[PDB]
């Protein structure tokens, strides 16, 4: 196809994993707002790892709690 490469997810852990790993690669800070983290991660196809934005936010919030303390 005329474009970049797309990722594919089948298990909730894999999709949630790409979203969390997506924030890690985006260096999202633990104090980033869903807007800053979501945009920095949406630019990446990993954002498609989650079909619901509510789960996308839970993974982002969990991502900050995993890179804090």
Burial of 4 (0-12, 13-18, 19+ CB in 10 A): exposed
With both helix axes pointing from N to C terminus, report the angle between 12-25 and 53-66 in degrees, rounded to the nearest 10.
60
**Method by which this entry was solved:** NMR
Q: Is 15 exposed, middle or buried (0-12, 13-18, 19+ CB in 10 A)?
A: buried
Tokens in use for 14?
């894999």
Structural domain count, the chain: 1
Q: Residue 52, Cβ neighbours under 10 Å: how many? A: 9
Cα–Cα–Cα angle for 28, 2, 39, rounded to 5 degrees: 20
Q: What is the CATH number of the domain that holds 51?
A: 1.10.10.440
- Domain span at residue 35? 1-69
């Amino acid at each position: 196809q005329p474009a970049k490469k797309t990722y594919t997810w089948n298990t909730k852990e894999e999709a949630k994993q790409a979203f969390k790993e997506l924030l890690k690669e985006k260096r999202v800070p633990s104090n980033a707002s869903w807007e800053q983290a979501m945009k920095m991660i949406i630019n990446d196809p990993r954002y498609s790892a989650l079909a619901k934005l509510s789960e996308k936010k839970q993974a982002f919030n969990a991502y900050k709690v995993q890179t804090e303390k």
